[PDB]
Design a protein around this ligand. Sequence first.
Ligand SMILES: C[C@@H](c1ccc(Cl)cc1)n1cnc(-c2ccccc2)c1-c1c(C(=O)NCCN2CCN(C3CCCCC3)CC2)[nH]c2cc(Cl)ccc12
Length: 84
Amino acid sequence: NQVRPKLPLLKILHAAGAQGEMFTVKEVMHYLGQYIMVKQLYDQQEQHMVYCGGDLLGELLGRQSFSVKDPSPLYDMLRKNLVT
Ligand SMILES: C[C@@H](c1ccc(Cl)cc1)n1cnc(-c2ccccc2)c1-c1c(C(=O)NCCN2CCN(C3CCCCC3)CC2)[nH]c2cc(Cl)ccc12
């Protein structure tokens, strides 16, 4: 049930308060949400929108932005970054 994130993703999780390097998928998603908060990547006016371009998260997603209503690009990134 646990996964090991690749190094760039691991750095992101730690910036969000995570410890160690083995996580459940739900932990990864929790900490990614927390990362978005701490780095203030969301639009205060449209809080469903995240602007990740120019942040390491954007580089990993291959995106400038995404909506939290549309999780599709997120789970594809996790496939390419989480080793089970
Ligand atoms: C349902 C869930 C979700 C979870 C996964 C996915 Cl692929 C989509 C959606 N979700 C709903 N809104 C968010 C969210 C929105 C804006 C900024 C930060 C987080 C999230 C995300 C969580 C999370 O663990 N969220 C706890 C509840 N959230 C409500 C919104 N809250 C705040 C939003 C910003 C302003 C203050 C309230 C934080 C607590 N983790 C995520 C990680 C990513 Cl890669 C993307 C989004 C989220």
